[PDB]
């Protein structure tokens, strides 16, 4: 199974740069018709960027062309994006995609999980995690992710085993420039005693990892 | 370049009623016979995924409920019946020429029946209180509508700009939301008094719900 993963995503100062590489895995990337890079900011919707065919040719959007590179690397099966001079407009959670061989080619059914560029001239923070003890039928439980910057923070509970039930919030902007959310499950109030329930908070631009536990008071 | 216009920008519909989504195309996106229009659907936190590619043909893997329909510059997603699974936002991209461009993508929710939320009050952890800060976390689970309001008492004293609201994407489960309500205060503030209260008043709820807890006990 054709799998794309990204990499080389977190902060970085105005008029900096950019260095992005999408690892091809299960798929040569010599097979593709093309390859490309496409960024989705809020309020922007979906702007693709550039792309690299199996020949070699490379194109790119006007409204980036001339600080914007795309390449590739066969023997690593990995191609990447290049872009300098960065505004803050330019932050957007960036995917890479692949093109087709047919209808025109250039529609994109394969994607990586994109991620997210952060343009800003503040300095990464990690975060602190709270738990949220449940009150003792069903009982809800969690963590508090509170002041990190920037965004994003993963959420995970019992490293995946625990999936139904759990909400995890969008985080929302404190007034202190630092980000905050919260992620919750509801699970029955007879688990309490005899089940443990581990929170996964994954802070990748400070690599601060925590797995908390959260038990009653 | 094309832009592609979407309408609605935004649709609520009942499960199991018939969705029709159209796109505008600034210029004709025909091409020797084919129509170069595409569409996708993205979930929360997901990649955008391909549906539709040459105007009406279907990806492979997607349900049949999906069809595309249309030439030139007018283009038109149907779902024939809407299921819980089918909550996200979707976009057209026309592929005739570069740069390739997206809609502004449409947001689809499932219009469910009216469900109450079940509230929980969380107190903050004293490992949180050891830092200065203190944070009172007020949790509304599985609700619907989206719309719901809550406010703070702490002493029968309504707070003010104290607190921030987050708001869950809609659960392909059940249809219902969730919602979270962080009251922030100092340690120092928040020692000084006793009663913290939540009050929720939501369509799904005759009078308002109230939880609280004693700081102590």
């Known amino acids: 199974e054709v799998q794309l993963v990204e990499s080389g995503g977190g902060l970085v100062q105005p008029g900096g740069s950019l260095r992005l590489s999408c690892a091809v895995s299960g798929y040569s990337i010599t097979s593709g018709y093309s390859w490309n890079w496409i960024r989705q900011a809020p309020g922007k919707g979906l702007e693709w960027v550039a792309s690299?065919?199996?020949?070699?040719?490379?194109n790119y959007n006007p409204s980036v062309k001339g600080r914007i590179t795309i390449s590739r690397d066969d023997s690593k099966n990995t191609f990447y994006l290049q872009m300098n001079s960065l505004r803050a407009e330019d932050t957007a959670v960036y995917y890479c995609?692949?093109?087709?061989?047919?209808?025109?080619?250039?529609?994109?059914?394969?994607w990586g999980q994109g991620t997210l560029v952060t343009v800003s001239s503040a300095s990464t923070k990690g975060p602190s995690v709270f738990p949220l003890a449940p009150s003792s039928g069903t009982a809800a439980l969690g963590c508090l992710v509170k002041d990190y910057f920037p965004e994003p923070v993963t959420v995970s509970w019992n490293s995946g085993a625990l999936t139904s039930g759990v909400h995890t919030f969008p985080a929302v902007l404190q007034s202190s420039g630092l980000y905050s959310l919260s992620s919750v499950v509801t699970v029955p109030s007879s688990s309490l005693g005899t089940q443990t329930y581990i929170c996964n908070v994954n802070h990748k631009p400070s690599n601060t990892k925590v797995d908390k536990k959260v038990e009653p008071k | 370049d094309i832009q592609l216009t979407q309408s609605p920008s935004s649709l609520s519909a009942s499960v199991g009623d018939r969705v029709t989504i159209t796109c505008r195309a600034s210029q004709s996106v025909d091409y020797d016979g084919d129509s170069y229009m595409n569409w996708y659907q993205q979930k929360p936190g997901k990649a955008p995924k391909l549906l539709i590619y040459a105007a009406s043909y279907l990806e492979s893997g997607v349900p049949s409920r999906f069809s595309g329909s249309g030439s030139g510059t007018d283009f038109t997603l149907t779902i024939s019946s809407l299921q819980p699974e089918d909550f996200a936002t979707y976009y057209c991209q026309q592929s005739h020429e570069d740069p390739y461009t997206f809609g502004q993508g449409t947001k689809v929710e499932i219009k469910r029946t009216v469900a109450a939320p079940s509230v929980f009050i969380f107190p903050p952890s004293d490992e949180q209180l050891k830092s200065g800060t203190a944070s009172v976390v007020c949790l509304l689970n599985n609700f619907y509508p989206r719309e719901a309001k809550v406010q703070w008492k702490v002493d029968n004293a309504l707070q003010s700009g104290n607190s921030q609201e987050s708001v869950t994407e809609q659960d392909s489960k059940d249809s219902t939301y969730s919602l979270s309500s962080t009251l922030t205060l100092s340690k120092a503030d928040y020692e000084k008094h006793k009663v913290y209260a939540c009050e929720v008043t939501h369509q799904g709820l005759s009078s308002p719900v109230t939880k609280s807890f004693n700081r102590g006990e």
């Open positions: 690299i065919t199996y020949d070699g040719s490379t």
């Open positions: 995609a692949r093109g087709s061989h047919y209808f025109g080619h250039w529609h994109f059914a394969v």
